[PDB]
RNA sequence: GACCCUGUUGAGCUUGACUCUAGUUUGACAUUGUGAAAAGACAUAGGAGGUGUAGAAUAGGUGGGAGCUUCGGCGCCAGUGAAAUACCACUACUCCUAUUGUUUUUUUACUUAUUCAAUUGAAGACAUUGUCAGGUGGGGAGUUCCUUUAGUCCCUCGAAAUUUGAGGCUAGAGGAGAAAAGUUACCACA
């Protein structure tokens, strides 16, 4: 890729295609990524997860599946925290699991807690796409949450086509730049090959 | 609700727990409800008629002469004979031993009849097990060509061997080979026949084992090996002959991943074959989607055979066409 | 009498070796062309779709995205669904049309091939022919590894929205030669 036309594109999303469209939606951007030759059907499926450490989207509805020594730090945080009767309650009614998982985008689990989790709702709420992420044994909530999100989960589907939502208005040009190059070097380290492989960029927005 | 039809369903008619959720799937619920009655329901029994040593008409007056009560099944066959009482057993009867007449079900006819074999022509059946459809092959083409039959169980081929020459075929040798090896052994064939082994879903009054001993695992093996079944007999035929043959897809089984998907997969691959009207005089057209995934529009021209429409097993019935 | 045995005869059952090959057979490629008529395939350029179920519904699919917003219709939401409709952004199959072509067949003839009489006429692009890649081979010439089970879930080929199947590899146990041989709580005879 060239830097040159990483910057063209960018003054021509910011503040070209902010004057042309006046966006009345969240402003953000998203990278669609096609690719030549590589049969999703075959072997050698990527499914790998890019560190961030920008947080492009803010509004990031969170929750956590807390043991003991969470519930005051979460509170404080206003962080949703569940004891073991309420993951009880939620496994009582499946419908309700769900509707909750489309609200919240991401899980955090503890360490014990993913071993309970298996039992009965563990591959019901697996046939999502949903995989809640480990806690290490630091337990600090705060900026843990902050490194656990924004980590861009680069999965192969059967489909020839890939998009990824990346990138605020409200941030400077330097830095979400180093989130385009970051997203596409690991993306390409994924791949089976290198540059070759891809076939398009489109850094467009949504708007 | 779906959740307590799925489990009053299990309970009551005895099914697996996944395969009532797959059959519910593909129909709307009133017809899954007439569709379970007729399934586990018996079928009506059905004569074919040998038109070498005989015919239709004379052979019914024997048999109502030796007692049997019969009526000629519908107008798609001139060949079938439905019974409905007996005072002699059939296969008693001396008419049975000449080889007048033999004990067949209604989804043996129609790949035949699907089929159109003709004289001095090559022709072929990957799976002969009864022998009921070799028979029948063997009748259209008047004692010409030649059949080569064929059933990886030395078992059956004991009745394949009793049934041919009882019936007076004269023309038909077996082999008990594999049949995705059939190919590489002779090729070039004009009218390839194939009844794959399947699920037994369209058949559950003969195999009640299916009501529960069928699976995930079951399901994905099974349809696995129709694919490499069906790229066989594309890899068997002619593309060009002096009269034009043709393959027959036929299974057993009601399922979706051993219908509608392996023609799927074998018109992907192979691009030299096409799908026309089967000939069949009626039946329903194939699902264009079913979970998400097309399928090409050809499948419209295949017909699927239902218990609780007509009183015959569940069936798929496809003929191709080679180009090339 | 039952019952046991011996010999002959039936019913079997298990064998009856390996390598090239006669024979025989499948596919592919050539002599084997020249026209017409059609048909089909792909090469590009246009036009239009779509009702398994449920969902109010003729839901390709996919990226996001929650009023983009002319009416606040459509939205949002709610359902219903594997997938959900607003908004923009992408590209698939099918069926037609066109010419912006490459072709492949079938039919109809002719002989420009090919085969017989002859030693110029008919058949006629059919055969026929040869070469590769195979199948079989109780025949001809010489010659003296598989079976049962598990693992590497390692490698290869398949299949599947991520797990399977088939081959490879490894390790626990077995081994005078198409003229005829061993066996049965079996049959008929002596």
Same mark, same amino acid.
């Not at chain 2, 299990?10 to 059959?23: F, R, S």
């Not at chain 2, 090996?225 to 036929?250: E, F, M, P, R, W």
């Given at each position: ?23 009345? %939606?969240?402003?953000? !951007? ?114 843990? !949450? ?7 989960? %680069? ?8 998009? !990824? ?43 | ?31 899954? %409800? ?77 790949? !035949? ?181 097309? %399928? ?29």
């Amino acid at each position: 890729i060239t830097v040159a036309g990483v910057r063209q594109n960018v003054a021509e999303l910011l503040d070209y295609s902010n004057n042309v469209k006046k966006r009345n %939606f969240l402003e953000t !951007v998203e990278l669609q990524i096609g690719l030549k030759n590589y049969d999703p059907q075959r072997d050698k499926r990527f499914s790998g997860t890019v560190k961030l450490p920008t947080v492009p989207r803010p509004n990031m509805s969170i929750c956590i599946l807390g043991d003991q020594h969470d519930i005051d730090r979460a509170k404080h945080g206003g962080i949703d925290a569940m004891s073991a009767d309420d993951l009880k309650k939620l496994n009582k009614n499946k419908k309700l699991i769900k509707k909750l998982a489309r609200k919240y985008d991401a899980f955090i689990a503890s360490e014990s807690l993913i071993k309970q989790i298996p039992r009965l709702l563990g591959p019901g709420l697996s046939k999502a796409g949903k995989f809640p992420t480990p806690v290490s044994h630091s337990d600090d909530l705060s900026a843990k !949450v902050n490194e656990v999100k924004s980590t861009v989960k %680069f999965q192969l589907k059967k489909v020839l086509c890939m998009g !990824v939502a990346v990138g605020n208005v409200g941030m400077t040009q330097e830095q979400l730049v180093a989130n385009i190059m970051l997203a596409i070097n690991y993306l390409v380290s994924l791949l089976k090959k290198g540059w070759q492989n891809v076939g398009s960029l489109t850094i467009k927005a949504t708007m | 609700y779906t959740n307590q039809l799925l489990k009053d369903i299990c309970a009551y008619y005895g099914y697996n727990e996944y395969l009532a959720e797959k059959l519910l799937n593909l129909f709307p619920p009133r017809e899954a %409800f007439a569709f379970f009655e007729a399934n586990e329901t018996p079928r009506p029994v059905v004569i074919r008629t040998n038109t070498l040593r005989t015919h239709r008409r004379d052979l019914a007056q024997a048999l109502i002469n030796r007692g049997v009560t019969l009526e000629p099944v519908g107008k798609w066959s001139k060949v079938g004979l439905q019974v409905f009482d007996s005072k002699v057993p059939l296969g008693a009867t001396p008419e049975y031993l000449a080889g007048h007449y033999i004990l067949q079900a209604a989804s043996s006819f129609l790949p !035949v009849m699907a089929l159109c074999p003709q004289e001095n022509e090559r022709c072929l059946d990957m799976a002969a097990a009864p022998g009921g459809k070799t028979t029948h092959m063997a009748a259209l083409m008047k004692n010409t060509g030649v059949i080569f039959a064929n059933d990886p169980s030395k078992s059956r081929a004991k009745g394949l061997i009793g049934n041919i020459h009882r019936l007076g075929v004269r023309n038909t040798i077996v082999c008990n080979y594999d049949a995705r090896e059939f190919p590489r052994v002779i090729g070039g064939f004009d009218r390839v026949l194939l009844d794959a082994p399947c699920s037994g879903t369209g058949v559950i009054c003969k195999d009640p084992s299916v009501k529960t001993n069928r699976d995930a695992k079951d399901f994905m093996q099974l349809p696995h090996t129709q694919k490499q079944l069906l790229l066989a007999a594309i890899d068997s035929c002619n593309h060009a002959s002096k009269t034009g043959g043709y393959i027959v897809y036929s299974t057993c089984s009601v399922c979706v991943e051993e219908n509608e998907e392996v023609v799927n997969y074998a018109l992907s691959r192979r691009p030299n074959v096409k799908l026309v009207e089967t000939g069949l005089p009626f039946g329903k057209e194939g699902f264009t989607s079913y979970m998400g995934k097309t %399928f090409h529009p050809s499948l419209k021209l295949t017909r699927r055979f239902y218990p609780h429409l007509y009183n015959v097993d569940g069936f798929f019935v496809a003929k191709f066409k080679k180009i090339g």
